[PDB]
Symmetry: D2
């Protein structure tokens, strides 16, 4: 599983459940092509977005729909979404975990990149 | 000054100087129309992007060129850039300060919103 | 496993391996009594600090020796250590994960608290 | 002003006003000797804790009373407080700004260190 997204709610100290996540990949013509999507589970994780074979080198964008998460809790948050844009697999295949820590007016994003 | 951006370097413990910042407004056809830009000063701040008159309600994107900053320091970074997207002035004009705390494989973006 | 500590290096985008962690509990006389200790594994996690039965209500302090981690990498970091002080189990037993994200001049700490 | 503390509220998007801050210096017997204190202003800042003459080399602890702040807002917090511990002036006198970004179950502390 080479791309995993984990989303945590820093207000409640809990996984952020049912958060929509959309992944895009930059094409040769420079547009953003839809690549995969999903929602976070009860553990705040989203697995199974892609496979080692499909996840070739390229520039990827992960957009996490944090506004709908907060709005469902009654909150009008600052960000429309939490983004992550990155070059993947430049020196060969790696496994990427994207960790997003969410608050209504702040978000932090961290990548843990490992080599199997 | 309705929009200010402050960028800090968590590796060196310093303002992040000469970071390029580009601001866009979402156009009616959902494309991003570039609005303003500048580079952070010696205190890591960027002032004067826009004015109260021009900064009408809408959705804005602030792109911070973090990859160029880390490259200039000789440090391998994860992200292409950091993209803060937010709806402005939804309840009246506000002053926004966006604080970006940078590390090579992690960053956080926080908004401090005050009502003049 | 009711107390778990996970430590990540935000510079390299990796688990922070072999980081010493000391846990203390406030006694009735208000001193800090040593409670458990350990080091993070290859995954940056430290499991097995305590048991559900031993981990009674109280105020706990987790001190993560981040200075030795950075010094071994050649870096003189800002913090002497990363602390976490918290009341545990006030409304009954819970499971606590403490996530520390480390940079030489910044650290973030987040608690994920769940109810089995 | 060799030591300043700035505290921000990630839930409301604002300076964290009237937060108590206590500074200690480690004594020769390893006890913490309280040094100075104050509360953050309307801009979330606390200036004037110490002076260049008094702020000699040593190990300092800054305790930020985050639990009282969250209680005053009616929000359940995780931590008892946030404790930033650092060695000061090891390579000569520096000006330190400690920035604390607060959420109820997460916080980060960053130092901006500049040489006058």
């Amino acid at each position: 599983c080479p791309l995993m997204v984990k989303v945590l709610d820093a207000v409640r100290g809990s996984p952020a459940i049912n958060v929509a996540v959309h992944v895009f990949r930059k094409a040769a013509d420079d547009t953003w092509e839809p690549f995969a999507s999903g929602k976070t589970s009860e553990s705040g994780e989203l697995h199974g977005l892609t496979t080692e074979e499909e996840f070739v080198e390229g520039i990827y964008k992960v957009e996490i729909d944090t506004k709908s998460y907060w709005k469902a809790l009654g909150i009008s948050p600052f960000h429309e979404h939490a983004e992550v844009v990155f070059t993947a697999n430049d020196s060969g295949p790696r496994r990427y975990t994207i960790i997003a820590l969410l608050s209504p007016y702040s978000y932090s994003t961290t990548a843990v990149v490992t080599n199997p």
